[PDB]
Amino acid sequence: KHKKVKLAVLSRRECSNPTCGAGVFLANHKDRLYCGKCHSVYKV
Amino acid sequence: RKTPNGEGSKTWETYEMRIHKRYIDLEAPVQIVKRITQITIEPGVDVEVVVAS
């Protein structure tokens, strides 16, 4: 079953689609915010 | 079928409820209906008025 790998204190600027209630991502330039399930493709 | 399970001689219960309906046609004014319908209330016998004739 799931472990949920725990990361210490977080940590960038405001998120694109929702309010400032999340952080933008460290991926293959594929920003993918999970409050509003996902709607960004660029470096916004 | 009487038995809760399948086993036993095939005996059958025929429970029969009765419903009797009655039909009254008065030529009352507005005066009487607001007293006659408010009175004559009995348990087990439910009465409805079709006061739109």
Add this chain to the structure above:
Amino acid sequence: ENVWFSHPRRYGKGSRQCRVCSSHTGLIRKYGLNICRQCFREKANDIGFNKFR
């Protein structure tokens, strides 16, 4: 952890269950009773059904 799966149960035996028993089998749907054959015999005189013949 998706939507708790519950796929169409809107007809046949496993759509509706006995009003009291929660049984799928031996229902009386007649006159919208929705009571199991056994449960119904227990609550026969309660609802009004009594045997004459």
Add this chain to the structure above:
Amino acid sequence: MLMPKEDRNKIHQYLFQEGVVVAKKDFNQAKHEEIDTKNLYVIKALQSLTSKGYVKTQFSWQYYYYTLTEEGVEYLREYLNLPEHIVPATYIQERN
């Protein structure tokens, strides 16, 4: 039963305003009547209270009947912050 603090406060605020809860046992019933939340949430929030604490449960014809006791109102008012002499069916509210 990881019920949001909002979703559990809703049923506690309800049980305060009413003093009575009736819930059809039918689990995964998208929403309950008189409470704007899921059904298994109402059943298991009041089961989590009845089994250990401060509320009583009766079952009849696939319907839970939850009624509140005097230990009910006392514990649930330290939860919810009300003074005393409350609105549920504990005493006289209407001309009855």
Add this chain to the structure above:
Amino acid sequence: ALISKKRKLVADGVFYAELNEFFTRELAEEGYSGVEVRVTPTKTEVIIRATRTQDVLGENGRRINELTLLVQKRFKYAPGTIVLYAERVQDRGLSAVAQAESMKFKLLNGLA
């Protein structure tokens, strides 16, 4: 309305059966000898034929108020459209239900 009388009498017949079994499960310890439902304009009066009413009512009509709200929210009645009364049991000794429950309690209290 509109629901057929053929069906509707059976519908409120089953209401009586569910009521009888609800009070036969809950108010069986304070005695119980059946219920009565009188249907009135703007009112349906359910009267409990139970024994000691000083506990059936509860205190100050607390318990009966809690039974009224229970039976109301069950069948989604509007507050005031249904009332709960508590009658006395006419010659308790004939109530076969009251003798059965009282004996059941005697047998659960460790008695031969």
Add this chain to the structure above:
RNA sequence: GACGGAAGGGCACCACCAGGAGUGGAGCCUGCGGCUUAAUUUGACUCAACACGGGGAAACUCACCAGGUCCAGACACAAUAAGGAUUGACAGAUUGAGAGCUCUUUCUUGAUUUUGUGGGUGGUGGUGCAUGGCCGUUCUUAGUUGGUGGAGUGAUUUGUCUGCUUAAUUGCGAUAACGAACGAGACCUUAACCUACUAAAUAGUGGUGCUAGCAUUUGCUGGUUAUCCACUUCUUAGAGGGACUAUCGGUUUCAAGCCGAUGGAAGUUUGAGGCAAUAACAGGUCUGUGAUGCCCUUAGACGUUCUGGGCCGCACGCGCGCUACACUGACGGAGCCAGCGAGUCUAACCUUGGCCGAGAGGUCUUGGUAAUCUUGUGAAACUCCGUCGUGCUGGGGAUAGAGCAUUGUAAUUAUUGCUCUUCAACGAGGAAUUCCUAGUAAGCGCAAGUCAUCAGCUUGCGUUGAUUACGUCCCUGCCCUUUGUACACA
């Protein structure tokens, strides 16, 4: 007490007689064994298992199988833990799979959980040989008990019986018995009678009026739920009435009764049911029940959810059925009449009517929450006219082929329906065995239950409507008494 191939008296179409209609033969449907299988879930095996579990499974039901999640792990306690217990997630991978079920990315969250330890819940898991309840059966027959008294050392006995009646321990009676209770009867529902009451635009009818057609004189056959009058024959449900073997004759000590005739709607307890004793079974059901003891599991779940599969699998055997083997018939036309049902509101019911269609079935409206509409459910057998002429034939319609629809998330292992083609066995059924005495058997269909769809099933109802008994212990069992017994789980 039980048994007897021992006796006596009576009784039963779950016995026989006299017959009738069958099943057993044939094809198919359906249940059960068996074999197979991933599993073909499971209960019941004489009467009292096998169209039974209201058990007509496409999923659900579902208990069985291959494989998935999830917690719905109440609480109580100890831990990590706000320099996060823990939650969920788009996207590739992963898989029946928009499954974050698990992996990579790394965000969302914020005390609700989660990790051990007790403790609990659920369980169509096990035990009907732990039980409750309910049911079937012994047992459709008439049988069973306690008070007081009598007999007996006691278990027990008499009451509860020789005889004669009865459907009957029903009675007349005789009497260590007297006086009682239960069961039978009574009771209740129902189906028949009511030129009598009480009323009916949710039932009819006879009248007038607006009229249609044939006639011509007045007369016939119709239409008009919003044209009025009247009653109650028909129809409906209320209160009642009538039948008690009534009267007469027989006939038994002329007692209870029974037999015959007459009258009467009715003369079998008037027909049919419901209710139904004491005692009993190690009868069935723990798979109807938040009915339940105990036992087993409790998350890699034996909980309930999802996908698909199976309950339908076929050398074979058995039980209820359906269709038939035709001329007392088939087919085509026309003729053309029931009864008991049931039926939708925030839902998709019964569905007129008009159009499309060879169908099946579609469309656009419509009446009915119903003595108002479906509906006169103008059902089938049946009736008449005609086409087949003793042939596996046009009887029979099984198997198969292709197509068109409907229900349903889903029709393949063909749901059902419909069209055309394919035409099998079956020439009245061996040894056996079932049910039946009058509006009954039998033929005929109809409505209701499950039901989205599926009846060859059941529960009911009318349609048509016999033959043959009106009896007796020969078989199979029953009840009472006598008797024998080495039996008493008899």
